[PDB]
Amino acid sequence: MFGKLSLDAVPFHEPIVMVTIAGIILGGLALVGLITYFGKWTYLWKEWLTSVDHKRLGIMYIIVAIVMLLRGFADAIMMRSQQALASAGEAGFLPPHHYDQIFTAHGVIMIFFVAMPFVIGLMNLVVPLQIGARDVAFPFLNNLSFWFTVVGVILVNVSLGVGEFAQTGWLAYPPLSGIEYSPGVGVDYWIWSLQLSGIGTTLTGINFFVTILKMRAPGMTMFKMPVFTWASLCANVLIIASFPILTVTVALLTLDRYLGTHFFTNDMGGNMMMYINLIWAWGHPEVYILILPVFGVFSEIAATFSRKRLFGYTSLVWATVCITVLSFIVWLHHFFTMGAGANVNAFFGITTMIIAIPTGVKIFNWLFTMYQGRIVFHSAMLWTIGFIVTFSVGGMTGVLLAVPGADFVLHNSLFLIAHFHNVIIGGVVFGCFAGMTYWWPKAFGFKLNETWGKRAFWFWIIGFFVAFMPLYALGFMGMTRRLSQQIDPQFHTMLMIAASGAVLIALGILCLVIQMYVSIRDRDQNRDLTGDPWGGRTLEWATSSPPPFYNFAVVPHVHERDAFWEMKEKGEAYKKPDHYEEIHMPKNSGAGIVIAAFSTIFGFAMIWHIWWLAIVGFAGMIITWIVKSFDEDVDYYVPVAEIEKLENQHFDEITKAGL
Amino acid sequence: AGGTKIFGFWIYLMSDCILFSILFATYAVLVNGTAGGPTGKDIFELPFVLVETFLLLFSSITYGMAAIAMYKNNKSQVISWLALTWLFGAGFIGMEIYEFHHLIVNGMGPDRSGFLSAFFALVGTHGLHVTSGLIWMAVLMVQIARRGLTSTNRTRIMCLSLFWHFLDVVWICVFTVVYLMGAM
Amino acid sequence: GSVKTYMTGFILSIILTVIPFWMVMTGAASPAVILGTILAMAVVQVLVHLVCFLHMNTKSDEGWNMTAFVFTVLIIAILVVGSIWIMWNLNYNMMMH
Amino acid sequence: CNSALLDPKGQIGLEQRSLILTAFGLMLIVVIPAILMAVGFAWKYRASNKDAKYSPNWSHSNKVEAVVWTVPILIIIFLAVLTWKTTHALEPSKPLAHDEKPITIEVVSMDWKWFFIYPEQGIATVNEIAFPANTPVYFKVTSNSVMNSFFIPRLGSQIYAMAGMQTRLHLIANEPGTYDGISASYSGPGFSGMKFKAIATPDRAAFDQWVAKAKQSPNTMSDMAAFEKLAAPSEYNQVEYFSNVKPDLFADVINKFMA
């Protein structure tokens, strides 16, 4: 009640916000009403919400990412609608107070709560399966890491209804994000969404680093690992080494707005150029966190659907290690126009193009993976071919931006905007949709619809090109980013084509919903029985579909690369053991939800200066941490009668289907 | 099992060391950003820092003696050695609170002269880590007194051994860069 | 045994703290020699604490637990020296020339 | 093709267009074969194509992996010789070798407009500059507020404007005309209206008439109290002329953050 909450924070007399507030409240109450109508509250608890299983946690990461993809796109369709109206002389809807929180929210939601959970969710589902592990290294920490991301999506979504979001852009540059130019609660919503979600993904990077190094199957060395595991290993290194930079940089912004300190101010000895140095020292390794497991996704798919071994494994592995080291020395290219000398700008310009060399090694290794194979045009293979065409265009564009002399006329332009949507939609979003289609039978036991999955590709491909190749042309014409009102009429008819391409992307999102509906409606017909719906090469496809919740009755003995492909070639590939042993598994824990529930209370009270509620919210997290340490019922043993029931019902489906 | 959590906590301390290096880089940029106010030579009392350095050093060897007693079956000596490094760590915190209280009262707080912002954000962040390890040490002390030197308790002693010795490593970089370079 | 390593690393760290503190508090007739010896003894005392207290070793986690420390030293040196060199050139510029 | 970067009117913009064109041509020798092999190998090596060779166990070739490493290395090597020479040639705050007495214009970012000072002429303007064609222009850029970016896209490079700081930019116009300049860094609600006109006069006779026009205005900027009256927040400002300016006004804007 106390603090700055005053019921004038709720945006009444503002119809665009109030319709979307009522669409989420009534859309959320209808979701609550369906669970109590079907009686699934005791099923979502104890099987999904408290789950320490990496397969359950991996699915829920993607569910959060897909839902936030709907919100982050439905306000991107409002910027395309506004810029088409603002050009050719109409001051329509979306005033600059309304418009400037939209790109800040679109940048934050799509980076942190769409691309990050989809990449982490694909690593959560697949990486313990590919190395022969039964779970992640720290299973309670994996459940806690998911719910810290949920705290991030709660705080951004209540900024829609309770207050306002930031109006500074998605990285919240200084003094405009300072307390004397942004006195409202919008930057505080930006600060505590990134802080509380950012400590969750930091624990994710530690968890998968230890899992790949320590929880591997016997006989699997590092150079016998799957390439997706190699790409996930290097992506988690960048999480451990760069998300601490985001933690300090937002905390130094927090001390400026709350305690009146002088870090990035103009007046009392603060340096505002230090934040931009610090926010991009995290900022470029963040975009290599997104693109690295996508490189691992496409390497498994291109080997599977060419029916051929992956070309140049050692070159592909060392290109990934080259990327994870060169990602930390290139970050000055985001502020070439700040005023550093020719020596500084040329040094970081030269080494930015050096990181293009291991990216080109990866591209041509996938091309020669499909050079003499038998290519089956699956939906997931279509995203792979469309990735190579798209990522080569926007990747080449970024190397043009890496030249400081070229960047002096293209900085903060729509050329820049078209560059990074070219390598995110082309790279990350195509990779996330490819890995979603590829590992759907392993996650759920049935296959997605092939007809509606291809139509989703054809709308996401050149429908993107209608959306963003005009922004390449507009970046040459001189149109800058974040432009809202009274746009030049020469920029009209090029913003009109870009708005038409956003409609084609909307149909591909709609084709994904139809593909998911039809596949669930017809799951009994497209059932995956053997656990290997394609010709799979890695150890994930040796299990049943879905895996038996311990993933492996006996842990596999790895001797070579593509371990399941060697087992099928050697002829064994499905061997029922004479006896089974008990399996040590962790228990589901209600804590982690409780720690995150106190943290979103703590985060909300820090935004609205409710200091008694912030102390209660912070002490609730610490006490729940302390009282969890006294718990001794953390693990249990799976009986052999439970294992033999699950294994014998897998091996008769192997008997029925020929093998 | 035990070595997996110990290795995982070592990776967290490597990310925590990168966290402190951002504060060190922010301090080095902003060390000359005194807005007409005090500099390092007008603030830093080096006999006061020298006592704080030895208190963290005395608690570093005291945790080592607690780890030695854990490698035998002396539950009582682990608790008594853990009680002494709590007192030395609370002495380190109390002198940093006394140092910060004197600056805020005398108008040299973090809201003036943004060198002082970088001073309070590096020494204060280190003191928040020592306070966090002092709470963890008290929680571990009551768990050993209740459950003994169990396998879960022996892993937690070695996890906090990595954490407590890391804070004395960070402090070596603190009094060098902040205090000794500032008081020249 | 292990008591000897804790005691030798305690005796060394007492000497490696007193001498840099005594040189500032006396003056030592040279500013540049003080700064060199302070940073030298700071690096040495860090290495004493890694070996004697943290028990760092090349064979502790099958080669790891040391390469992770070497990697983060290089990341810190990239982040600190890189940001200082950037901010020195940004602050040498943006002046009333 | 006629869009202010492929058709630039300044020497810096003309040198930057050749830098964009040579870089884009150099990257096309590896990107076009990457796209053509993506569609070409997919068509030729279909599973339904029974005439193509199938080599499932082929995964290593020393001659192929040599080329995959060499050609990106050789292109980036040629893309790093320039990107070193052009970075030192197209750098702002490096004066243009022209020897025609450069005109210094002092630039202040406001909320949300552009304030220009002509200290040699004693003239201050809002959201409009003028200078002779084929004469160097020395820009001293600062901010009174949050960070902006001074950008005339048809004339060349951009530079950031920061409070308490003085960035420097050198530009020149080869043809007379009026070029729209913008703010290229987002600065708040009035950011869409931070647009100015840069007029390149045919000669210095027409430039001196514009200066004589601007000193017929009754408004002056003789003190900082008149500056903070102008620096009150406003959007979509018209062109305004000030006849008498404080002689060291640009240093006073910087010193209100550095002192």
Ligand code: HEO
């Ligand atoms: C995950 C997304 C992602 C990816 C993959 C990349 C990859 C690259 N980034 Fe784009 N970056 C990304 C996300 C961003 N970068 C940005 C801004 C940005 C800027 C700033 C320009 C400006 O400020 O105006 C530069 C210079 C680059 C450079 C690059 C380069 C050189 C690559 C390279 O890694 C691409 C390498 C790929 C290539 C080159 C194609 C494949 C190679 C082939 C086919 C053959 C080999 C060819 C050669 C070696 C030439 N990034 C911004 C702006 C944020 C903001 O402004 O708010 C974002 C989000």
Ligand SMILES: CCCCCCCCCCCCCCCCCC(=O)OC[C@H](COP(=O)(O)OCCN)OC(=O)CCCCCCCCCCCCCCCCC
């Ligand atoms: C992160 C970057 C920023 C740093 C500052 C804030 C965060 C501080 C806390 C970080 C803790 C990191 C510890 C990681 C250790 C991982 C390796 C390890 O030792 O694992 C131990 C254990 C793993 O648990 P598991 O094996 O699954 O089984 C649990 C049985 N009870 O691990 C655990 O279960 C214990 C650790 C999990 C509990 C931590 C959750 C509370 C964090 C609240 C932070 C509040 C800060 C608020 C302010 C934000 C900044 C302004």
Ligand SMILES: CCCCCCCCCCCCCCCCCC(=O)OC[C@H](COP(=O)(O)OCCN)OC(=O)CCCCCCCCCCCCCCCCC
């Ligand atoms: C590679 C990893 C894969 C990607 C990760 C997942 C991302 C997408 C999430 C959707 C997938 C979850 C649903 C699929 C599970 C299989 C469905 C199922 O088992 O059926 C249960 C239920 C009805 O079946 P019942 O009779 O209860 O039990 C019989 C079981 N043979 O069937 C039902 O009708 C209920 C199914 C539950 C669906 C709830 C999930 C919400 C997902 C929201 C995403 C966005 C939706 C957009 C709008 C939809 C509404 C119009």
Ligand SMILES: CCCCCCCCCCCCCCCCCC(=O)OC[C@H](COP(=O)(O)OCCN)OC(=O)CCCCCCCCCCCCCCCCC
């Ligand atoms: C605090 C306010 C704000 C709140 C924010 C939201 C919190 C975060 C929510 C994230 C968690 C999402 C819930 C995950 C449930 C997914 C269930 C599912 O997909 O499986 C249903 C199940 C499938 O059958 P089976 O094959 O046995 O499943 C195992 C497959 N490996 O099928 C069955 O047999 C049983 C069918 C019952 C399942 C119905 C549950 C509906 C899904 C819940 C809502 C999901 C969509 C909305 C998510 C919003 C996220 C922001």
Ligand SMILES: CCCCCCCCCCCCCCCCCC(=O)OC[C@H](COP(=O)(O)OCCN)OC(=O)CCCCCCCCCCCCCCCCC
């Ligand atoms: C702004 C300040 C915010 C501060 C937030 C966090 C600090 C508050 C106090 C936390 C300390 C008490 C935590 C609980 C103590 C007992 C936990 C325990 O048993 O530790 C051992 C644990 C090994 O785990 P295990 O043995 O499996 O048992 C799991 C426990 N759930 O080992 C572990 O891995 C768990 C213990 C790890 C503790 C991590 C250290 C926290 C460092 C916090 C940084 C503080 C300042 C940061 C400022 C923001 C960034 C600038």
Ligand code: HEM
């Ligand atoms: C799928 C279709 C998408 C469309 C049509 C779209 C559209 C837009 C538009 C119109 C802008 C503002 C351009 C400007 O400022 O002039 C923008 C900015 C941005 N977009 Fe997207 N976007 C899409 C997807 C994504 C995705 C998937 C990401 C994932 C990371 C993303 C990240 C960003 C970021 C970071 C910004 C800059 C935020 C800011 O300016 O503050 N976008 N997008």
Ligand SMILES: [Cu+2]
């Ligand atoms: Cu970058």
